[PDB]
Design a protein around this ligand. Structure first.
Ligand SMILES: *Cc1cc2c(cc1C)nc1c(=O)[nH]c(=O)nc-1n2C[C@H](O)[C@H](O)[C@H](O)COP(=O)(O)OP(=O)(O)OC[C@H]1O[C@@H](n2cnc3c(N)ncnc32)[C@H](O)[C@@H]1O
Ligand SMILES: NC(=O)c1ccc(OC(F)(F)F)cc1NC(=O)Nc1cc(Cl)cc(Cl)c1CCO
Length: 460
C-alpha cells in the first residue's frame, strides 16, 4: 500500500528539523496510505537481521533530531483519503473525532468546525504540528491550566508498536500502552489514530494583554487566574505571559488572557472581562484588547510565521529551550535568568511564562512534570541570526547557563521536549520510579529500540 522514496528533496527534509542543528540522514522515506502500511514497515524492521531505525515524522518541528532515523526509514506521516466525522456519545457526555496520527491540528480544527461547529478544547500555540507528534510530548498552550494538556484530552489511540503490531488502547483497554504512548517521546509505538475530545466551539475571542513591572505581582496574578473555576465560576479561557525588554523595573511582564464567547454569551462578555480584570493588579492604562474570530486567534502564530518567511528569518537555527519550573522557585528564576543570564544587550524571539495545575496532568502518562501542584512553563524561543553560525553558538551557551543555574541552585526544573542524550541525564529527568516504568514499557513494546531512536534514550 505504501511507497519507499529515495528522492533527494524527501531525504533532505527527513534529515533536518525546525532546530536546524541535528542532521542524521535515513536510507529512505516511507509514504504510507493507511495504518497497515506503517505496521508492515515496522514489522519488516523488527524482523530484519540488523533491526534498522524507524521514526515517524509529523511536521518536522523537533528541535534536536527527535524525528530522525540515522540510516533507517523516516515515515512521512503527512497525508495532505476519507476523514471520520465527529461523533456524539451519550456515555462520554460529549463529542470526539478520530484523526490520522499525521494530521495537522490546523486541519483538525477546520474539519471539526465545518462538521457541527466543534473543536478540541486544549491547544498548542502553533497549529502546524501533527496530532501524533504533540501527543508524544504533551501539547501545551494557555488552556492547559483548565483542560490539561492535549494528552489529557484524548480517549483512545491506534498504535503500531515496535513489534509492528496494531493495538487499540484507551484507559479501559491496553491502558499501559495508552498511558505509556502519551508523552512517551515515540518510544513504544507510532500513533496511527487518535480519538480527540471536542466541545462546541466559541465563535469569537476577546484577546487581552496587560503590562506589569513587578514580577511578584505578575506571578501572583497568573497563579490567581489559573485557580478560577470552582462551581463553574467566572474565569478566562486562556492564560499565558511573556517577558519584555524595557524599550520601576528594566524588565516588563506581559499578562495575556482571553475570553471565548458565542452568539448566546456575546452580551455578557464585556461585563465578564471588566469584572475579572478589576480583580487584577496590572499597570493602569496598559490594557490592549482585540476581538477576532476563534480560528484567527488560534492561528496567530502562523501569521507571525508568514512575516518571518517574508524576511528570510524562518529557515534559521532555532535552539529553543522549554522548561517546567516549580512555582516555589519561580521568583529566583526572574533574578537569575530574566535579569541575570538574559540581562543586558543579548543577541531575537519571545520568552513565554505561565503557570499550570499538575492535577490536570494524569500521573499514569509518560509526561514528566515537576513534583509540585503548580508549575510554570518557561519557553525560551530565541532564534539564531540567518547564515551566522556564531549566533547559534552564543544562544547555545546561554541555554547551558540557564540549565547550569537550575542545577546549581537546586531548582527541580524538568525539560519539556527533553534534549538529554546521556543515560544518567535521562535517569535524573525521569527519577527512579518513572525510569523503571519507562524501560519496562520499552522492553515490552520496542525491545529492539527501533522507534524514535533520535530521542537518544535507548540503543539496540
Ligand atoms: C516548530 C514549532 C514547535 C512547537 C511550536 C511552534 C513551532 C514553530 N509550538 C508549540 C506549542 O505551542 N506547544 C507545544 O506543546 N509544542 C509546540 N511546539 C513543539 C511541538 O509540540 C513538537 O515539536 C512535537 O514534536 C510535535 O511536532 P511534530 O508534529 O512536527 O513532530 P516531530 O517533530 O516530527 O516528531 C516528534 C517526536 O515524535 C515522534 N512522532 C512523530 N509523529 C508520531 C506519531 N504519529 N506517533 C508516534 N510518534 C510520532 C517523532 O519520531 C519524534 O520522536
Ligand atoms: N507568542 C507565541 O506563542 C509564539 C510567537 C512566535 C513564535 O515563533 C515562531 F517562530 F513560530 F514564529 C512561536 C510562538 N509560540 C511557540 O512556538 N510556543 C511554543 C513552542 C515550543 Cl517548541 C514549545 C512550547 Cl511549550 C510552546 C508554547 C509556549 O506557550
Amino acid at each position: 500500500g505504501g511507497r519507499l522514496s529515495v528522492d533527494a528533496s524527501d531525504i533532505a527534509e527527513a534529515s533536518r528539523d525546525f532546530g536546524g542543528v541535528a542532521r542524521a540522514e535515513p536510507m529512505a522515506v516511507f509514504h504510507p496510505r493507511a495504518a497497515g502500511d506503517v505496521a508492515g514497515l515496522v514489522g519488516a524492521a523488527f524482523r530484519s537481521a540488523r533491526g534498522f531505525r524507524v521514526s515517524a515524522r509529523g511536521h518536522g518541528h523537533s528541535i534536536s533530531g527527535q524525528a530522525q532515523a540515522a540510516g533507517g526509514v523516516v515515515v512521512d506521516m503527512s497525508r495532505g483519503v476519507a476523514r471520520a466525522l465527529p461523533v456524539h456519545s451519550a456515555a462520554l457526555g460529549g463529542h470526539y473525532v478520530d484523526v490520522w496520527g499525521g494530521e495537522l491540528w490546523v486541519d483538525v480544527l477546520n474539519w471539526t468546525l465545518s462538521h457541527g461547529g466543534l473543536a478540541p478544547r486544549s491547544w498548542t500555540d502553533y497549529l502546524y504540528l501533527s496530532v501524533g507528534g504533540t501527543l508524544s510530548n504533551a501539547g501545551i498552550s494557555g488552556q492547559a491550566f483548565h483542560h490539561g494538556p492535549q494528552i489529557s484530552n484524548v480517549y483512545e489511540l491506534d498504535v503500531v508498536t515496535g513489534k509492528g503490531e496494531v493495538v487499540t488502547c484507551s484507559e479501559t483497554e491496553n491502558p499501559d500502552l495508552f498511558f505509556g504512548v502519551l508523552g512517551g517521546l515515540g518510544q513504544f509505538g507510532i500513533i496511527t489514530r487518535a480519538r480527540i475530545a471536542l466541545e462546541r466551539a466559541p465563535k469569537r475571542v476577546r484577546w487581552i494583554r496587560a503590562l506589569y513591572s513587578n514580577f511578584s505581582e505578575f506571578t501572583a496574578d497568573q497563579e490567581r487566574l489559573i485557580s478560577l473555576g470552582s462551581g463553574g465560576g467566572r474565569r478566562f479561557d486562556y492564560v499565558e505571559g511573556f517577558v519584555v525588554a524595557a524599550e520601576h523595573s528594566s524588565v516588563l511582564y506581559c499578562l495575556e488572557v482571553t475570553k471565548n464567547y458565542d452568539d448566546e454569551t456575546a452580551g455578557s462578555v464585556d461585563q465578564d472581562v471588566d469584572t475579572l480584570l478589576g480583580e487584577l493588579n496590572f499597570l493602569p492604562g496598559t490594557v490592549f484588547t482585540t476581538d477576532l474570530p476563534y480560528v484567527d486567534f488560534l492561528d496567530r502564530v502562523h501569521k507571525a510565521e508568514l512575516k518571518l518567511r517574508a524576511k528570510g528569518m524562518w529557515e534559521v537555527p532555532h535552539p529553543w529551550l522549554n522548561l517546567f519550573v516549580p512555582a516555589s522557585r519561580i521568583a529566583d528564576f526572574d533574578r537569575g535568568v530574566f535579569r541575570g543570564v538574559l540581562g543586558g544587550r543579548t543577541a531575537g524571539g519571545p520568552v513565554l511564562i505561565y503557570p499550570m495545575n499538575k492535577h490536570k496532568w494524569d500521573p499514569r502518562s509518560s509526561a514528566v512534570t515537576p513534583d509540585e501542584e503548580v508549575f510554570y512553563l518557561v519557553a525560551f524561543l530565541r532564534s539564531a541570526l540567518p547564515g551566522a553560525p556564531e549566533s547559534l553558538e552564543a544562544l547555545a551557551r546561554q541555554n547551558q547557563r540557564i540549565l547550569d543555574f537550575c542545577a546549581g541552585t537546586g531548582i527541580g526544573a524538568k525539560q519539556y521536549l527533553p534534549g538529554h542524550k546521556a543515560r544518567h541525564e535521562w535517569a535524573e529527568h525521569f527519577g527512579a520510579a518513572r525510569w523503571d516504568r519507562f524501560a519496562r514499557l520499552k522492553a515490552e513494546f520496542d525491545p529492539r529500540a527501533i522507534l524514535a531512536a533520535g530521542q537518544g534514550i535507548f540503543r539496540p
